[PDB]
Symmetry: C9
Subunit: 107 residues, 9 copies
């Protein structure tokens, strides 16, 4: 076996609903770091649920990045989106995820 | 054997049909991450079907990236394209795919 | 033995004929990803035939990239080029190809 | 096993409360360096609590970066935020964290 | 032994003759990819002969890149250059060549 | 075990006190290089104490960088800061620190 | 032993003489690629002698690069420089040379 | 054990005294290259003493770089600084130093 | 043991004397490539002596780079500098040097 690391980023734009921004397949064991930035021009805090072996909730105020590092990462969702007609949340995420891949069944 | 990683990106432009944007050969076992961005200037949501050992459907609203990580990735298609004469969907995809390659039958 | 990866790109300009854009030597076993972009300024769809252990045909509409990943890649050709005197197709391709090379007969 | 290093940065904006800016999952053993910059345009000092096997408190004056290197890094928080209605603290953090990951349970 | 890869590019300017643009020494066993671009401002097609274990001839129309991947690469020549006093062919080549080198007779 | 290298930089701004700019946890054995620059616009010399297995004091005049390389690096402090109401010291530091990390207790 | 690769470039300016542009020490066994460009503003062809186990002569017309790949590379010289008072040859070379180096007599 | 390389640069500004610009701890065995540049705007030569297993003195005239490569590098100092009230020496140094670090006493 | 490669460059400015631009310590066995450029604005040729197991002399005319590759490189000097009051030689050197370093006496 060898470890494989994937590094990726993405955008969040919101302008009580849950929006899933990342998930695994329920099979892959993923460890690593998740970072979520909420832009300083956002009207509201960004509430994030990270599901691993535990459920953790974080709040990023406008202009702040939250970061989490752990094992068995399963999903990341934006939660508790307020029902404000003037809502504007601009954000960015970055992920560094590592899993293990077998080389036995190699073509 | 050794693992090989391919990293590639591409564009999506749509201006109920299914459009296949990526597929494998049905033989290669591919693991990795797929990211699909729908540009903020799009008129509609981008519906994506990812086929692996399971079929998953995702929806990217304008200005959002969806990401998926899994084993046995087989195809990615845009699905549920609406019959609107004013439709405009601009998007981008990024893939990090890893497979296993033998070194036995080497020239 | 070791695996070798070649990464290369090239241009397509057309302004029923078949144009071969890439082929192997018929000996090298090549696996990897092929991406074909058809520029948004093209007048027509780009029809592509990829020959491996199977023959696959793809169509890239103007502004779209098609991608394929597989084993035993042998050739890529533009096919079904229409007999229009006003035809303009501008495109680009990208390839990530991996083969296996012996180190026994080393100088 | 192999070591994995994650490198990440983020922003701090404050305009007695504690704000957690980074934490681990309580399982991952993280070693590395933490750097915290307080911008020269800040009105106040930035007080930082780093929790590892010990609790350390640091103060970054406006225009200064503090750095810490250690084992068993668990969390970083902004602490002792003053109750001033004219407070403005702009900062940045950088982290280089290394953990160990097994390759036994590899897919 | 170890494999060595050389990557190089060069220019072609023509403004029935054969022009050799690359050759080996007749001893080194070279495998890899050859790409030949003919610029869109060229007046004529670029005819290329690639000698390996077989002789292959390719034609690049103005604005097109041809690519070839194989073993035992020996030479590349421009062939069938027309006797036109107004001829202008501007082109570029790219090569990724791999050979094997012994470490027995090491100083 | 494997070696881990951390590379980091930071700013110094002073506008007899001791200011600690970096320290370890008292457990990690760190080897490497420390460089301290005092900007040419500074009014005074920058006095630096580097604690390792020995205590070394250095003085960087305005526009000069001092560098030190050694084992068992423990802390770096600015020392002997003069009581001048017109003092202005702008500086920068750079560190390349290497430690050893076990892979026995790997998750 | 290990292989070492050196990559270097240089300029040629001439404004029947032989000019040696590169040579080895007569001991080192060098394999690799030599590329010689003759600038499009040159008045004359650039004649190049490459000495290896064989002597090869090449001619680069203005605006062309010649390339050679082989073993036992010993020297490269400009040859057959014409006795023209208005001669102007501007050129560039690039070399990728690999040799083998022992690690037995290591300090 | 593994080798560690540190690469660093710094500035020299002088506007018979000895100024130590770099030293080791007297324990670390450092091998590598030292380069010292004296700027073309300097009024005087830069005299440099490099202490290793031997003491070497070098002189860099304005606009020249001196370089030295050796084992057991211990210190570099500017020496023989003239007592001229109009002296201006601007310089830069670059170091590539390699030492050996054990992995036995790893945390 | 492992091989270590140092890569460095420097400037030459002269505006019969010998100027040593590089030397080793007389202990380190250095192999590699030396390149010496003489700028096109120089009034005179640059004569270079390279000492290895043999003494070689080279002449770089204005606008030319000379290159040499060999074992047991010991020193490079500018030689035969003419006694002209209007002399101006601007040059640059580049070195890629490899030596062998033991890991037995590791701290």
């Amino acid at each position: 076996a060898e470890l494989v690391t994937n590094e990726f980023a993405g955008d969040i734009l919101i302008s009580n609903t849950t929006v899933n921004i990342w998930k695994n397949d329920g099979i892959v064991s993923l460890s690593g770091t998740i970072s979520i930035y909420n832009n300083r021009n956002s009207t509201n805090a960004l509430s994030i649920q990270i599901i691993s072996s535990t459920t953790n909730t974080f709040t990023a105020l406008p202009g702040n990045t939250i970061s989490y590092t752990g094992f068995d990462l399963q999903s990341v969702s934006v939660i508790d989106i307020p029902s404000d007609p003037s809502i504007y949340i601009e954000g960015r995420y970055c992920f560094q995820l590592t899993y293990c891949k077998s080389k036995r069944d190699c073509l």
